Curated annotation (Swiss-Prot):
Coiled coil: none annotated. This is GTPase KRas. The modification N-acetylthreonine is found at residue 3. It comes from Homo sapiens. PROSITE patterns: RAS.
Amino acid sequence: HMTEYKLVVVGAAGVGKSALTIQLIQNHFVDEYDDSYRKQVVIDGETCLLDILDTDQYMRTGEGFLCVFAINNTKSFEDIHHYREQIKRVKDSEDVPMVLVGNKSDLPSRTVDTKQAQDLARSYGIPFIETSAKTRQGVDDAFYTLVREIRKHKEK
Ligand SMILES: Nc1nc2c(ncn2[C@@H]2O[C@@H](COP(=O)(O)OP(=O)(O)NP(=O)(O)O)[C@@H](O)[C@@H]2O)c(=O)[nH]1
Ligand SMILES: [Mg+2]
């Protein structure tokens, strides 16, 4: 009675992968942290069980990927290329469900502009969503959009 979606969250250290996952799950912002999580949620009339790995037999079996950088961490943005190449390598495909997420939108120290990010996402043929795990802006959007990209890609 529920559709399972296996989602994987990837990106450089400190970008807020856990904090995003934890917002989605417990609607709380964790300043201080350090596996798999489940969330049941209705998306467009379908009861979904999200199976989320916050980072292989999850890399190879993942159905969709959130590729996260922080908008105040130019390196993390530059690293996205590597993570996308990694995902492509495991799946012999240039069409893997994926969303580029620019996190920490609440912070003032912004070194990656919305147009760099938009340009990168356009080149890959994927959505870009800006988030803050702190304020919760964009978080549901990012996960719901990923679910929708998986459905666009294959029957579920
Ligand atoms: N203002 C603000 N701060 C944020 C936001 N999101 C996270 N933070 C902050 O950075 C955290 C570090 O993020 P984590 O979730 O642990 O990062 P991971 O990518 O999981 N690292 P790893 O497990 O690969 O080592 C933490 O100091 C603080 O909560 C956000 O949106 N805004
Ligand atoms: Mg983490």
